[PDB]
Design a protein around this ligand. Structure first.
Ligand SMILES: *[C@H](C)[C@H]1/C(=C/c2[nH]c(/C=C3N=C(/C=C4\NC(=O)C(CC)=C4C)C(C)=C\3CCC(=O)O)c(CCC(=O)O)c2C)NC(=O)[C@@H]1C
Ligand SMILES: *[C@H](C)[C@H]1/C(=C/c2[nH]c(/C=C3N=C(/C=C4\NC(=O)C(CC)=C4C)C(C)=C\3CCC(=O)O)c(CCC(=O)O)c2C)NC(=O)[C@@H]1C
Ligand SMILES: *[C@H](C)[C@H]1/C(=C/c2[nH]c(/C=C3N=C(/C=C4\NC(=O)C(CC)=C4C)C(C)=C\3CCC(=O)O)c(CCC(=O)O)c2C)NC(=O)[C@@H]1C
Ligand SMILES: CCC1=C(C)/C(=C/C2=NC(=C\c3[nH]c(/C=C4\NC(=O)[C@H](C)[C@H]4CC)c(C)c3CCC(=O)O)/C(CCC(=O)O)=C2C)NC1=O
Ligand SMILES: CCC1=C(C)/C(=C/C2=NC(=C\c3[nH]c(/C=C4\NC(=O)[C@H](C)[C@H]4CC)c(C)c3CCC(=O)O)/C(CCC(=O)O)=C2C)NC1=O
Ligand SMILES: CCC1=C(C)/C(=C/C2=NC(=C\c3[nH]c(/C=C4\NC(=O)[C@H](C)[C@H]4CC)c(C)c3CCC(=O)O)/C(CCC(=O)O)=C2C)NC1=O
Ligand SMILES: CCC1=C(C)/C(=C/C2=NC(=C\c3[nH]c(/C=C4\NC(=O)[C@H](C)[C@H]4CC)c(C)c3CCC(=O)O)/C(CCC(=O)O)=C2C)NC1=O
Ligand SMILES: CCC1=C(C)/C(=C/C2=NC(=C\c3[nH]c(/C=C4\NC(=O)[C@H](C)[C@H]4CC)c(C)c3CCC(=O)O)/C(CCC(=O)O)=C2C)NC1=O
Ligand SMILES: CCC1=C(C)/C(=C/C2=NC(=C\c3[nH]c(/C=C4\NC(=O)[C@H](C)[C@H]4CC)c(C)c3CCC(=O)O)/C(CCC(=O)O)=C2C)NC1=O
Ligand SMILES: CCC1=C(C)/C(=C/C2=NC(=C\c3[nH]c(/C=C4\NC(=O)[C@H](C)[C@H]4CC)c(C)c3CCC(=O)O)/C(CCC(=O)O)=C2C)NC1=O
Ligand SMILES: CCC1=C(C)/C(=C/C2=NC(=C\c3[nH]c(/C=C4\NC(=O)[C@H](C)[C@H]4CC)c(C)c3CCC(=O)O)/C(CCC(=O)O)=C2C)NC1=O
Ligand SMILES: CCC1=C(C)/C(=C/C2=NC(=C\c3[nH]c(/C=C4\NC(=O)[C@H](C)[C@H]4CC)c(C)c3CCC(=O)O)/C(CCC(=O)O)=C2C)NC1=O
Ligand SMILES: CCC1=C(C)/C(=C/C2=NC(=C\c3[nH]c(/C=C4\NC(=O)[C@H](C)[C@H]4CC)c(C)c3CCC(=O)O)/C(CCC(=O)O)=C2C)NC1=O
Ligand SMILES: CCC1=C(C)/C(=C/C2=NC(=C\c3[nH]c(/C=C4\NC(=O)[C@H](C)[C@H]4CC)c(C)c3CCC(=O)O)/C(CCC(=O)O)=C2C)NC1=O
Lengths: 81, 272, 162, 172, 172, 172, 172, 162
């Protein structure tokens, strides 16, 4: 759904910070329990950004901040440590 | 499924399988178990050597920099998955392998195969692999933190009934894999997926038949699913297009000669 | 596979009937004769290496041309001699299996069925194996009830090859 | 199909080795047990009809849901097929006792029997219960000291019990 | 998400009250305007590609710093992404017009969009100018009197302009 | 996670030394009150649904603003989430009681729970009150004299109470 | 997957009756056998690498065609996969000894192993030979009188031998 | 970090339900054998220096080339002997940790995971540590349930290194 894919520049990584992930008729579909709703950090490449945004949006999550990384590696995520 | 069905079908261990979820602040044992479960299920129960164990994405999980879904994507986008399931396989087989590994499912219909083939032709292998992980079904079923597992033997919300019967044609057993000799496998679903039908399951103890005194010298039966047409000689009236033949060893070569002389095509031969 | 017990069960199953006194007599003859069959198989197992080497040597005495002239089917090289020793070991091992089983079932399943097509295809002469089995008849050393067991299976393979 | 001798004959032929002294001594022990084996086969063959009728009667006394109108063993033909099934299972247990190996029972009778009972709607648990009742009937008749010379015959009774247990487990 | 009915439903469930006469009368008036609303949705959908292409033409005509080598909308990949962004924004404006509430536009398009454009280096003022041009094109296309029956449509045009100004303000 | 054994194993590994005699005597004491620990775990597990339902009833009794239309516990979904949260907190307190250390409770239940409740708008003071109510309900279940062998259980009761205060302090 | 208890529970639930006293006494006999069972499991687990390595070396002494260039066990990868299959079969034999039922072998270890070895070109008779050689090594390990208290362990040895013979018969 | 209790809680939490009688029986087995594990850990803590020195002597006895071949991986100098002695002390200390914990968990996160890369990179033969662990098996001198876990954790690291 993007022209970014099949491109080196489309491997630019970003971090989405999303809040408010809660059960809803849109979330009633999920087969697994969600454990955190405070501040979820997801690393997303450029090509995959459209998919991630829709996915976050479809579930009702609210995006607070998107931090650029200037790298293909997810090393400056540093949230699960 | 319950005990009596899964004991006959040989899918007991799939039904008593707990989906591994990598919780936050997990111990190294839990991360190792998640990595091993991903290597068992995404790489299709292959004997995975340490020389292609993908240490970078393993450290990215250990690091908590990537999620379980990212690890699954990393494994499926690696050259281990490309060599094992993509390069020597045809497109139908590769799409079925993607469904079994990433989504834990058999494909439901031919337009799904056409969509994935069109997406491969339009955007490469990477785009195609992403299609499965960045799908609504993956997010709902496994999401970010649950290791994918086979869901074809359970009742799913958006599933086709033919998916349960096709899951046995895709999942051959617990002590099986998706590797063949020469790493090139043909799809078992192309006859039905294109035609929107189903085959009998015949998995494990389901495949067996009663022998009695009719089995010949070797007490074993052979099971032949054969598509039958009208004979040019018109000697015997054909009653059904799809026919079942249970024949002994001592008549198996003769029966294959009969089917080949009748012009009928053999679709399945198994033990019974 | 064909043994007295298997034949009795196959016939009683073909008639769909229980095992009468006839099948009990079949098992009684099998049981009486089986101890001598097991002793014969034990003695042939212990003397197997010497018997196979002597049988191959006796084939080379009656048929010296198998050791001189070149050919894939002949024992002029070490590969052909190894193939001949392996063949005679197969023959003697299946004769011991027939001694244990109490019938020509191991010969019929493992060696007799299709040996004509093997000897035709790979240009092997059945007279070589007939002399090998005749050497086993000459030097097995069994006496009494066990000897007639061993000679029956050796002559059964001889009558199949000739 | 195999007997007690031909099972280890085939297992040795698959390895390409001669039978060792331990295997020949085990077969000699089987030959020594063979007279009691023939006695057990003879006793079950003699009282086969009594075993089938008494165990069917006990099974339908304990499980009256099978004979009720609409039950699986209801209708003379289905009840006949029931008694025929019990008689055939007894016949193949006697065949396996005679051969000393369960090749005939598993390969000719138990293979595909569960699929047949599932496809007909036959309750395989009830078949297993009937086979179990036939098991204590057969081990009561075999281990009867009357009318026979005495001797320790626990091994052949355990072997018949194992044949009955794999017959009941192949339908349950 | 919410539409023009379920927004009032959610507000009433938060207050825990039945809907009064005024809220039901306002919803009945919205249903009376609904045919005009569907006409607006149909016209913007039917001329969506023309709106996006003409807005891109006018935006990169008045702002040539974006299509020049180095500009964000330079390179057919980034230009295709920009045209996709105009199509997405127009599509979600039609979605918000269809529902009658901007819950789908905030929660499905405009959330995280400012932070997306900041992290990407996308100039959000240029996107806001493109949204302004799609607003004027869509409001000219809705207010076309030809080929449709006469009526007053100031309320739905004001609502569409509010949705467009909401889309432009979320990226500026 | 950790239990009472791997906690001091990890401390001795971080110090890089063997466990001294006092550490092993303390672990032998932990083995001595282990049976009372298993009793407490079993009693809270057996009365868990009654504890959760009674704590919820008391919490909505003297704090009725949770169930009021618009309250955080109003709507089946939100009440089902509330009772599910009570079940999870009680389950993880039993997990920490079973291990003898609050690593599983702080690392898999209370890790990230407070900002989860902040982002949802869940009033954490009322959650801490419900955790307190489950605390006296569980300690009343544990310290029931009937149907149990007599003995002093103040250490395991104090440890369960400490786990409940860690659960309540992490959400308030 | 069953243990020695839940297999009897499964046939009893299929029959729909409580366990008779004979089944409870047999389960108590297996409970008394369980200490020797855990000894056998612990000994095979402790000497698993030695059993696998010895059986591999003596299997290729018996069958040099497997490691010969072009053989199935030639190439490090295939050799490493063969060694993993040997230790997996030993591991599932320890599992089946541990539970007391062979349901884990037929449901997990031998579930489709014949089809897999046919598809891979793996000679299953060589695998069965290696399973018999691991069987001999494991039975010499279990029946070792050194370093353990005395007792009759013919039942657990016969059960382990039955699990090994069923594992070998599934691939041959 | 696996023990009876931690795996019991992990299994129950993967189920998503409470602690049934299964986990209670797990805790009962842990309580039954934890006293013998603590006594075994106390005895090996007391005899740690003697058993590490004896294990190093046994390694030098079976592998004398470690004491005479010059190299950074070998114990030809006092530095290599000190590294070998502290390696065997590490093996014994995490064995005592496994005795205290009641499972192979301390071996799994402290020693077993990654040890193939350690022995590959620094050219350490795992048979040296195998002989060291066989000395610890031969001479720890416990009896009953204390020796049985002692053989359990020792042969666990034997099987992981070989
Ligand atoms: C060793 C004694 C013999 C041998 C073995 C050999 N096996 C394979 C490949 C596989 N083996 C299995 C078996 C299992 N996998 C499991 O997860 C389980 C537990 C349920 C079992 C029993 C599987 C699935 C494979 C294929 C997938 C994989 O490789 O992991 C090979 C490799 C064949 C190839 O060409 O790739 C070999 C060589 N080979 C011998 O010659 C011995 C007789
Ligand atoms: C020995 C008396 C003389 C001799 C023998 C010779 N035999 C072969 C080849 C084969 N022999 C067999 C026989 C069997 N295979 C079986 O499985 C069984 C039953 C267990 C039997 C009896 C077969 C199948 C072959 C061909 C396949 C193979 O090579 O194994 C050869 C080689 C022939 C060739 O062309 O390669 C030889 C030389 N040759 C003599 O000169 C002796 C007098
Ligand atoms: C009555 C005239 C005399 C009598 C009868 C008697 N019958 C039985 C047992 C059985 N009868 C049947 C018959 C049918 N079953 C069917 O499904 C159908 C078709 C619908 C028929 C006709 C069967 C199957 C049985 C046995 C199974 C069962 O118990 O239900 C008994 C009992 C025999 C036993 O050993 O338990 C008796 C006593 N007996 C008399 O004295 C009357 C003169
Ligand atoms: C495409 C839509 C769709 C259909 C049609 C469907 C059918 C369906 N029914 C199933 C099981 C089942 N269905 C039944 C039903 C019955 N048993 C009886 O005795 C009665 C006659 C009958 C009810 C009227 C039972 C008992 C099972 C479980 C079998 C077992 O686990 O052993 C299963 C196995 C997986 C599971 O247990 O969820 C499927 C897939 N699933 C679907 O997604
Ligand atoms: C994309 C390429 C890539 C990089 C660069 C990378 C780095 C990396 N190093 C890590 C850990 C680590 N790295 C070290 C390294 C050391 N400690 C020292 O004292 C020395 C100074 C040094 C080696 C000389 C250690 C000890 C850890 C483990 C930290 C811990 O688990 O406590 C981790 C955490 C996950 C893990 O434990 O494996 C990452 C992600 N991972 C990748 O995939
Ligand atoms: C290889 C030897 C062999 C076996 C083992 C065998 C089993 C067998 N049992 C059958 C039927 C049957 N079996 C039963 C048996 C029972 N119903 C009950 O309720 C009781 C639990 C039980 C008696 C213990 C019944 C009632 C049927 C008929 C089902 C029907 O046609 O409606 C059928 C269907 C074919 C037929 O009508 O005979 C087969 C093949 N047939 C063979 O040739
Ligand atoms: C053709 C009909 C026929 C049959 C079947 C037959 C069987 C038969 N059973 C025998 C022995 C025997 N049979 C038994 C059997 C048993 N002892 C017991 O106390 C148990 C109740 C029971 C197990 C069912 C024993 C222990 C022997 C003696 C040991 C042996 O000869 O093997 C003997 C040896 C001769 C004798 O002492 O009587 C024969 C011939 N003979 C015939 O002519
Ligand atoms: C570096 C990669 C790259 C490419 C390839 C590219 C192409 C490109 N050509 C365009 C327009 C255009 N291209 C043409 C071209 C032609 N008209 C004709 O009659 C001739 C036959 C033909 C020349 C061969 C015209 C007339 C337009 C203007 C279209 C418009 O304003 O509506 C536009 C629209 C935006 C704009 O007005 O600049 C793009 C993006 N842009 C890029 O960043
Ligand atoms: C669900 C709804 C949705 C929205 C809202 C969305 C916005 C969106 N716009 C993007 C990129 C972009 N958007 C633009 C847009 C523009 N550049 C300009 O100069 C103009 C001012 C403007 C057009 C008017 C450009 C140039 C990029 C690519 C940035 C880059 O490649 O570095 C990206 C990066 C991911 C990708 O393009 O594949 C996202 C997610 N994606 C979605 O799925
Ligand atoms: C499935 C495709 C489809 C659509 C979309 C549709 C819409 C539609 N719009 C209508 C009316 C209307 N549409 C408008 C709209 C407007 N009037 C104006 O002068 C403004 C330019 C403009 C606002 C954009 C008005 C004023 C009415 C009459 C009032 C009303 O019916 O609500 C009517 C009533 C029947 C009629 O008089 O034509 C229909 C059916 N019918 C269909 O079959
Ligand atoms: C807006 C969606 C929504 C629903 C449906 C809802 C139902 C609901 N009903 C409840 C209680 C209750 N409901 C009843 C109802 C009845 N008792 C009877 O005897 C009658 C036959 C019957 C009426 C038809 C009673 C007695 C309780 C109190 C239970 C208790 O305190 O233990 C409770 C427990 C919490 C409380 O005390 O408020 C809830 C959550 N709550 C919601 O937020
Ligand atoms: C699998 C299910 C199961 C469980 C859970 C179980 C627990 C259990 N608790 C015990 C003891 C005990 N339990 C308690 C507990 C208490 N005493 C009190 O007065 C307080 C109210 C309470 C704290 C909650 C005490 C004091 C003992 C005796 C001391 C000890 O054995 O540790 C004993 C020793 C045997 C006995 O004397 O009864 C067992 C076996 N046994 C089982 O089979
Ligand atoms: C084509 C890829 C490939 C490789 C690399 C390979 C290696 C390989 N070397 C082996 C054995 C062996 N390798 C050696 C080698 C040596 N011993 C010494 O003292 C020397 C210092 C040293 C030579 C440098 C020995 C002694 C064995 C036998 C081990 C045994 O039987 O226990 C074995 C065991 C199976 C067998 O006996 O054949 C394999 C699989 N196999 C393969 O298929
Ligand atoms: C966690 C590690 C651990 C294990 C595995 C363990 C096993 C264990 N095996 C026992 C007994 C036993 N083990 C055997 C086993 C055998 N006897 C033989 O001569 C055969 C060679 C062999 C069969 C392999 C026997 C016969 C007993 C005594 C009977 C019984 O207690 O069941 C006992 C009873 C206490 C004793 O007398 O030693 C224990 C605790 N204890 C532990 O702490």
């Amino acid at each position: 759904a993007t022209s970014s894919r099949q491109s080196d520049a489309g491997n630019r990584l970003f971090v989405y910070e999303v809040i408010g992930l809660s059960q809803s008729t849109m979330t009633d579909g999920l087969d697994y329990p969600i454990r955190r709703s405070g501040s979820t950090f997801i690393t997303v490449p450029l090509k995959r950004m459209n998919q991630e945004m829709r996915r976050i949006t479809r579930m009702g999550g609210k995006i607070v901040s998107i931090k650029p990384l200037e790298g293909d590696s997810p090393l400056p995520h540093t949230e699960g440590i | 499924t319950s005990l009596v069905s899964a004991q006959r079908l040989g899918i007991v261990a799939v039904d008593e399988a707990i989906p591994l979820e990598l919780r936050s602040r997990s111990t190294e044992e839990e991360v190792d178990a998640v990595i091993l479960a991903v290597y068992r299920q995404v790489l299709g129960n292959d004997h995975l050597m340490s020389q292609e164990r993908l240490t970078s994405a393993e450290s990215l999980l250990r690091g908590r920099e990537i999620s379980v879904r990212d690890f699954v994507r990393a494994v499926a986008l690696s050259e281990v998955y490309r060599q094992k399931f993509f390069h020597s396989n045809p497109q139908n087989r590769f799409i079925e392998l993607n469904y079994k590994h990433l989504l834990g499912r058999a494909p439901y219909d031919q337009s799904e195969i056409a969509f994935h083939t069109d997406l491969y032709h339009q955007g490469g292998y990477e785009a195609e692999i992403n299609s499965y992980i960045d799908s609504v079904e993956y997010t709902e079923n496994f999401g970010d933190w649950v290791v994918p597992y086979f869901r074809g033997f359970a009742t799913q919300r958006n599933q086709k009934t033919v998916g349960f019967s096709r899951s046995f044609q895709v999942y051959r057993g617990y002590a099986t894999s998706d590797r063949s000799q020469g790493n090139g496998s043909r799809s078992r679903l192309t006859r039905e997926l294109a035609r929107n039908t189903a085959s009998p399951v015949y998995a494990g103890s389901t495949a067996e038949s009663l022998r009695g005194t009719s089995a010949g010298s070797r007490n074993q039966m052979y099971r032949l699913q054969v598509i039958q047409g009208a004979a040019p000689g018109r000697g015997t009236r054909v009653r059904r297009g799809k026919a079942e033949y249970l024949v002994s060893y001592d008549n198996l070569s003769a029966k294959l000669q009969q089917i080949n002389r009748q012009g009928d095509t053999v679709t399945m031969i198994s033990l019974a | 596979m064909k043994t007295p017990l298997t034949e009795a069960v196959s016939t009683a199953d073909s008639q769909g009937r229980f095992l009468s006194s006839t099948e009990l007599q079949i098992a009684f003859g099998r049981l009486r004769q089986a101890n001598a069959g097991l002793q014969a198989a034990k003695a042939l197992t212990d003397n197997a290496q010497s018997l196979v080497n002597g049988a191959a040597q006796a084939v080379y005495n009656k048929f010296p041309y198998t050791t001189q002239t070149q050919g894939n089917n002949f024992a002029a090289d070490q590969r052909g001699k190894d193939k001949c020793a392996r063949d005679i070991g197969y023959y003697l091992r299946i004769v011991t299996y027939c001694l244990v089983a109490g019938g020509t079932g191991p010969l019929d399943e493992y060696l007799i069925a299709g040996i004509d097509e093997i000897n035709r295809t790979f240009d092997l002469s059945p007279s070589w194996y007939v002399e090998a089995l005749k050497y086993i008849k000459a030097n097995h050393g069994l006496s009494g009830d066990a000897r007639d067991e061993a000679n029956s299976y050796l002559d059964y393979a001889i009558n199949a090859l000739s | 199909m195999f007997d007690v001798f031909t099972r280890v004959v085939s297992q040795a032929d698959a390895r390409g080795e001669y039978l060792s002294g331990s295997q020949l001594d085990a077969l000699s022990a089987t030959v020594a047990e063979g007279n009691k084996r023939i006695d057990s086969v003879n006793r079950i063959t003699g009282n086969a009809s009594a075993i089938v009728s008494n165990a069917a009667r006990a099974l339908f006394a304990e499980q009256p849901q099978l004979i009720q109108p609409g039950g699986n063993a209801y209708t003379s033909r289905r009840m006949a097929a029931c008694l025929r099934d019990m008689e055939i299972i007894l016949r193949y247990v006697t065949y396996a006792t005679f051969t000393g190996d369960a090749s005939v029972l598993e390969d000719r009778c138990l293979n595909g029997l569960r699929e047949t009972y599932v496809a007909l709607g036959v309750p395989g648990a009830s078949v297993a219960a009937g086979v179990q009742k036939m098991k204590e009937a057969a081990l009561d008749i075999v281990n009867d000291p009357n009318g026979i010379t005495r001797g320790d015959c626990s091994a052949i009774v355990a072997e018949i019990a194992g044949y009955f247990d794999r017959a009941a487990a192949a339908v349950a």
